[PDB]
């Protein structure tokens, strides 16, 4: 994984000192320094003419170097391209696939990727629309017992649980070509507006625990498949979600973290990860809040 503790890992009290010394304005200025980082990588596949319409946004390409490639394609429309990047996590390579909100013409590509990448958990942090702006397609069967066929992948909705800030859908993916079935847990977090932060850092961290528990529960019933994490572009809330997850993973296990290093490295894998200085400052603030709440400081 690129997410090694070194070289300036910080303990949770050094983090308190750090945030206290920089303040919100300093953390905002730190975010801008990450954006300045020389964008290593290229975006050619994203901009190939056969692929333009497979991007939801003109200004959110994805990196050639880390993109998820589609293997078992069918149809001249299905290239090997999907706007989705492998992302390392704490002590794990390809912990996540950060992807955009699937478009109608990429629903089939999305499920192909989920299938091929052995994905067990999907985290969605977007509503379908926001401000009447379309933000993500309805790429899964929404009602219990309904099914959609995406070529040789039939997805069936096995049940939905509605909770506080998220709904948990259990999907069966049926590869009807290889007669293989796999359960996939789809999580949709509903209280995270685009370009913004969640209303409760505590709800996001509890949701993160729910997702980790689900990923852990699914992996024990099968090296570890990535978690698909998408928002609308799959960079703003996605990068924030994933950075927070890595930082809490390193904090839990090593007693250290480094937000800067985490987001800097994440943006070499899912380009443009973390979209606003507000979301950047939220990683710091949620971690400190988790740490107070836990009596670590």
């Amino acid at each position: 994984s690129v997410h090694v503790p070194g070289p300036h890992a910080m303990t949770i009290q050094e983090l308190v000192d750090y945030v206290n010394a920089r303040q919100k304005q300093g953390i905002y200025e730190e975010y801008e320094d990450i954006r300045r980082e020389n964008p290593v990588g290229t975006f050619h596949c994203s901009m190939s003419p056969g692929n333009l319409e497979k991007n939801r946004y003109g200004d959110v390409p994805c990196l050639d170097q880390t993109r998820v490639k589609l293997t078992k394609r069918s149809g001249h429309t299905q290239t090997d391209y999907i706007n989705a990047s492998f992302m390392d996590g704490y002590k794990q390579k390809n912990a996540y696939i950060g992807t955009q909100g699937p478009l109608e013409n990429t629903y089939r590509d999305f499920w192909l990727m989920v299938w091929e990448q052995k994905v067990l958990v999907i985290v969605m942090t977007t509503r379908f629309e926001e401000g009447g702006r379309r933000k993500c397609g309805q790429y899964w069967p929404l009602e219990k017992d309904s099914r959609i066929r995406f070529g040789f992948l039939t997805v069936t909705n096995l049940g939905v649980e509605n909770m506080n800030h998220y709904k948990k859908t259990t999907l069966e993916i049926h590869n009807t070509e290889e007669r293989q079935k796999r359960q996939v847990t789809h999580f949709q977090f509903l209280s995270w507006p685009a370009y913004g932060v969640p209303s409760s850092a505590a709800s996001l961290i509890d949701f993160l625990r729910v997702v980790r528990n689900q990923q852990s529960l699914a992996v024990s019933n099968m090296p570890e498949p990535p978690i698909v994490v998408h928002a609308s572009a799959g960079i703003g809330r996605t990068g924030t979600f994933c950075s927070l997850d890595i930082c809490l993973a390193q904090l839990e296990e090593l007693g250290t973290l480094n937000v800067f290093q985490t987001v800097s490295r994440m943006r070499t894998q899912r380009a443009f990860s973390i979209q606003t200085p507000e979301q950047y400052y939220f990683c710091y603030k949620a971690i400190l809040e988790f740490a107070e709440k836990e009596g670590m400081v």
Binding site: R56, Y57, G58, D59, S232, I235, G236, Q275
Partner: peptide, 7 residues
């Protein structure tokens, strides 16, 4: 077209 940034 559709832009993500600049709101």
């Amino acid at each position: 077209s559709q832009v993500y940034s600049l709101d």
